[PDB]
Design a protein around this ligand. Structure first.
Ligand code: FD6
Ligand code: CA
Ligand code: CA
Ligand code: CA
Length: 169
């Protein structure tokens, strides 16, 4: 069930009110009786808004960011925290979240491949490499074929295309 200390934490750490959090919890438990949102279920959530294409790979990429302790489950607290950031975060928070989405192997850098990875995922859910390379080449200042968080942040606050594609701009 929903412990008071979970509520206390979430009402302090997120942009949701206690009432909203309780409303989300009833819905969360209805869909996930064990309190655990799995990758399978997360995909079916996306399949519900993108029946046209195949949002499997995009949803999987989003899943690993939601799942912050990497145990293969999104518990309710992980769910609310990620939802808070992506729907109500300030520009810096949404950028940082965006960065973690692109940084697939979580090494703190975005490579071209990883940027290809996401754009492909977006495509399957809904020349392309050339436009990406162009934007990546523009963001990569010291020309090392990596994008640090700072390179990605400043690049997006000048060319927000890579970020808006994630509906976070
Ligand atoms: C790259 N991503 C970053 C996060 N962004 N927002 C949150 C994702 N999210 C969602 C979140 C939790 C549970 C279910 C869903 S389903 C859903 C449907 C449409 C949208 Cl536009 C977003 C979502 C969508 C774009
Ligand atoms: Ca987890
Ligand atoms: Ca990486
Ligand atoms: Ca760089």
């Amino acid at each position: 069930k929903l412990k008071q200390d979970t509520i206390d934490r979430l009402t302090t750490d997120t942009y949701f009110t206690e009432k909203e959090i309780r409303q989300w919890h009833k819905g969360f438990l209805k869909d996930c009786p064990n309190g655990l949102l799995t990758e399978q279920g997360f995909i079916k959530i996306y399949k519900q808004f993108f029946p046209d294409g195949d949002p499997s790979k995009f949803a999987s990429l989003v899943f690993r960011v939601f799942d912050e302790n990497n145990d293969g489950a999104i518990e309710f607290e992980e769910f609310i925290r990620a939802l808070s950031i992506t729907s109500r975060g300030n520009l810096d928070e949404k950028l940082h979240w965006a960065f973690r989405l692109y940084d697939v192997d979580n090494d703190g850098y975005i490579t071209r491949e990883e940027m290809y990875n996401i754009v492909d995922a977006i495509y399957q859910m809904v020349t392309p490499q050339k436009r990406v390379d162009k934007i990546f080449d523009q963001m990569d200042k010291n020309h090392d074929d990596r994008l640090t968080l700072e390179e990605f942040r400043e690049g997006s606050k000048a060319d927000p295309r890579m970020v808006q594609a994630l509906s976070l701009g």
